[PDB]
Amino acid sequence: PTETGVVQAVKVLLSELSVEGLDEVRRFIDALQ
Amino acid sequence: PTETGVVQAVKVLLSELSVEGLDEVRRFIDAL
Amino acid sequence: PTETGVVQAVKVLLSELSVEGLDEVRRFIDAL
Amino acid sequence: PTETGVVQAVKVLLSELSVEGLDEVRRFIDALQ
C-alpha cells in the first residue's frame, strides 16, 4: 500500500463526517506527531 | 457517512493491496 | 502503510455496508 | 454506515502514515469545517 492511495481514501471518508467525527479524528492526528 | 462514499474509499484502498490481502478481504465479505 | 493495517481498516468499513455495497466491493476485487 | 465505524477505520489508516501524509489530511479536515 502507498501513502498517496491511503490519503485519498481517508479524504473520501472524512468528507462525509459530522463535526463530532472530524474533531475526534483531528485529536487522533495530533497524537501521532 | 453514505454507502457510496464508503464503497468508493474501500475501492481506493483495495487497489493498493496484494493478492493475499484481497483474498482476506473477500473471505470477510463472505462472513457478512 | 502496511497491508495488515489497511486490511483491518477495510474490514471495519465493510462491517457497516449493506448487501448491495458488499456486492459492489466483491465485484471490484474480481477486477483486481 | 455509522460515523463511529468510519472514525475507527480512519484511525487505523492514519496511525501508519508519515508526517507528510498526516499533514495533508489535517489540511483537508480544516477545509471541512
Residue numbers in the entry:
A (entry chain B), D (entry chain B): 259 to 291
B (entry chain A), C (entry chain A): 259 to 290
What does the paper say about this structure?
However, those of TbCFAP410 and CrCFAP410 only partially dissolved in the buffer. We, therefore, carried out refolding for the insoluble polypeptides using the following protocol. The final condition for crystallizing the TbCFAP410-CTD contained 2.0 M (NH4)2SO4 and 5% (v/v) iso-propanol (4°C). The crystal structure of TbCFAP410-CTD was determined de novo using ARCIMBOLDO. Our in vivo data showed that TbCFAP410 localizes to both the basal body and the posterior cell tip. We observed that the A267E mutant that breaks the tetramer into two dimers could still localize to the posterior cell tip, but failed to target to the basal body. However, the disease-causing mutant L272P of TbCFAP410 completely lost its localization to both the posterior cell tip and the basal body. It suggests that targeting TbCFAP410 to the basal body requires the tetrameric assembly of the CTD. Therefore, we conclude that the localization of TbCFAP410 to the basal body and the posterior cell tip requires the CTD and its ability to oligomerize.
Cilia and flagella-associated protein 410 (CFAP410) localizes at the basal body of cilia/flagella and plays essential roles in ciliogenesis, neuronal development and DNA damage repair. All these three crystal structures show a similar homotetrameric arrangement, with each monomer consisting of two α helices that form an open nutcracker-like conformation. Two CTDs first form an intercalated homodimer, and two such dimers further assemble into a tetramer by packing head-to-head through their first helices.
